[model samples]
Target chain A: KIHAYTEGGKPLRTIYLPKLLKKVFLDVVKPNTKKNLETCGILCGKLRQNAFFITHLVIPLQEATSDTCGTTDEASLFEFQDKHNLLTLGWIHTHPTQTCFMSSVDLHTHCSYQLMLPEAIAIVMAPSKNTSGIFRLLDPEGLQTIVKCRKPGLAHPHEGKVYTMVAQPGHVREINSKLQVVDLR
Target chain B: MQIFVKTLTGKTITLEVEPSDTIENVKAKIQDKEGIPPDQQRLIFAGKQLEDGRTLSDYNIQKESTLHLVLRLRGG
Candidate 1:
């Protein structure tokens, strides 16, 4: 059977993300939502066959600002993943008052992830805008741009389309699967 | 001493290191094996951020000890 390969021809892993995870994550952040904050959670999964299935959503302890969120307790976060033997597949979070797109800082953040796992994704749930997206940085140009970026803050510029949606013949797919919420908050 | 450097993507790199070797040294090895630069590598051990100036033994990291590698999430 023919298979999809990354830019350099690396075999990609099929990630079976549950269809209900979006709603489940939306529900998980109702409190933070009311406060108009972006709450983030880690996607933990197990390897099956030649693919990865997201079986758990690990919500690390966090402090929420009005428009952003920060996670605390890294030791426990690492320990939790270690104990469960879970792979940090990707992350999902809400945009609260913003639209569905990666900010410059978001681009750099996801850049770190894509460098680690080619298929890693950033799922943005924008409630106020009533839209959502699964975003990933474009390789070579997009990826290299961020790597070479020397700007001082989140306001830096990334010329051209630095990121693209993860679908329409992409590495990520939404599948029917069970999701377990591991709320460490 | 031999220790493991585990990444967020679930891949682990086993590097021959020393208890006296600085965290920055480990990051250089990681950059050599992987393409991640030391500035972007965030090493976590015992739930705290490992400082670059410290050593494996500084935090009591020994043989077979696995340091979780996280990308420094510089966000908006």
Candidate 2:
């Protein structure tokens, strides 16, 4: 997963949809507030590529009814994937004015959406005064071991970039087990 | 009353609460003990998301009641 930090920092375990997609939502899709934006483009296609990565938040006007500073118009953002497609990704929402994180209703929506698409991603966009917080859905318990590599290590592909050294094995067992419990529920 | 908390990681921890304590109080206690911020914590009872300021009586939580506290996973 490609989590974009301040350009030069440790890569987060999961990647937020590349800048290509984030820009699309922030600039094009979300900006069209009057209606829903439907598309079959690079943003949709590449997001569909990463099935396991769940993009968490997509705060729409319908989501923020109490405070409607911009237009006070209600909008719903929906994403559709091909029936045969296995890659399921979620949405990205911005906390424009404040630093509020996910709420109970947000969690309900997340769990509800994931019930239909268990692999759906939840991406949150938090732009603060100077820095911002971009988070994706990742099970921290899934991390089993951390591997540290020294200089001049093997090249590995990560977040659309090639880098040398460092590999972490997120315990598949725990991840699968947790999913199993969710399945049973 | 003692309430059982099940973490998303499958670890179950127990906490004793006074009859006067509200669910919000329990949340704060867990945050204080576990170092999990209240904003990053979630409490689920009977498969439903619970809010703060709810009393134990609201959920009918009694001694040995089992509740799930899902700590929101952040970062990658």
Candidate 3:
């Protein structure tokens, strides 16, 4: 029922969030648990100079219960669509103090979203700077595929460039709570 | 004397310290150079978190001793 983005590969205009957005992100959306991380949508706006060119990015958050606990009261799929204005270009989510990358559950969610917005990019954010995460897309053959996206030299964000670190399927590594680097190779 | 500091990623760094240098002092210096937030950096000398105000000599750290500075990674 949710309207998804068109499947054609359209170049996404990458916009770096300034300090203000960063603060809002840290406050409004740091997912402490798995359900909280999985359900929340990362709403973004395309800006032209000073103002937002496009206003919203609709995402779905679901209630998932593990053996012990249940999820919090976050936005749901239908509620998300009704609340936002701009087209659902894509969405972003968190990992709950784990390595940056989509888990099996995330892959399923991505598939559901992709059924609507096939070209949508799922962004994953890791907690630390030194450690990195991965993003994946399903292949045309319907196989779970690793998506490759990279930026060169010293993984720091610069002015005018929104920096993101992505890993290929096999090349992706996981980080522990201690920020220790694990071998993905 | 020099102490060897190691990271979880298997990086070994060397720091020179005199007898007067305390464990806290060495940790502070490492934090400054590495830009590691104070709460994030942990000093595990011998499989245990080092207590504050403890001197390097109290932990039997001598010349060329190896101290592991395990930095915690936070995600999402």
Candidate 4:
């Protein structure tokens, strides 16, 4: 009741994530990190009292390049999420050599998740930069701009700011809890 | 046989199909009922992806077997 049913109505609820998720993710992807390849994980959780809590970070079996990481068997990914009764809150990934930002390619990747769930977020962790950022596509404007981008490349020409920082004045809050990392790799 | 299709939202849509029906065939039925295109569907049975060319019998799908349907996600 602390953060619900204002003039905002409902459907948008704060997500409480475990602070240790970043460490756990980094630990699991250390091998890939040393190899300098990208790593990704799906952040999933359950809704309680109209709010979301990230309880699981599912690492899917993926094919990784310097800039891309795609899960090979999404069938199992769905199977895992379905079996656990979890919602796909967002995703977390390492940027490797890049900065803490969502690339144009990332816009396309995140588009589907945000299109489905407005509360979904993208967590960028850059080991080289020694920094992290939480981001979200800025609703209609970001969705409208990115949904029609037809050309393909490592980067795209985003005319204006299609996203905003969600860590501050955000719907996300870090909590002390145990987060399960289900690595299907 | 009646096989079940499980969505990520946990709704089990039961479809009536023959053992001879291929994965594509089932996907079309799914499209008709669920509005999701055939190409967007990546189905799973017993932890393996059910390819389009393979028939239900190829995967030994029997009565009441639940197939997990995952939407395909892509990026650059």
Say what the interface RMSD of candidate 2 is.
13.3
lDDT of 4: 0.78
Screening candidate 3 with a backbone cut-off below 3 angstroms (N, C-alpha, C), the clashing residue pairs are A39-A61, A127-B74, A127-B75, A178-B72, A178-B73, A179-B72, A179-B73
The top-ranked prediction according to TM-score is 1
DockQ scores for all predicted structures: 0.46, 0.07, 0.01, 0.28
- Flag the better candidate by TM-score, 1 or 2: 1
How much lDDT does each candidate structure score? 0.78, 0.37, 0.41, 0.78
Which regions of candidate 3 deviate over 4 angstroms? A1-162, A167-185
The runs of at least 3 residues in candidate 1 whose Cα sits more than 4 Å from the true structure, single-residue gaps closed, are: B1-3, B14-19, B28-41, B45-49, B60-65, B71-76
What is candidate 2's lDDT per residue for B29-73, written digit by digit as tens? 875455444554567777566768878788877888888654332
Write one digit per residue (lDDT tens) for candidate 3, span B1-76.
Answer: 8888764222466787876777778877765554333433556666556666888888888898887653322212
Residue A122 shift from truth in candidate 2, angstroms: 9.6
lDDT by residue for model 2 over A1-185, one digit each (tens)? 23332123323333234434444344543442223222111112223243233222222232232212111111111112222122324434444444535433333333322222323334443333222333222222111001111212122211222111112222010121111000000
| Candidate 2 CAPRI level | incorrect
**Which model, 3 or 4, shows the larger DockQ?**
4
Off by over 4 Å in 2: A1-29, A32-185, B7-13, B39-42, B47-54, B70-76
lDDT accuracy of residue A94 in candidate 1:
80
Better of 1 and 3 by lDDT: 1
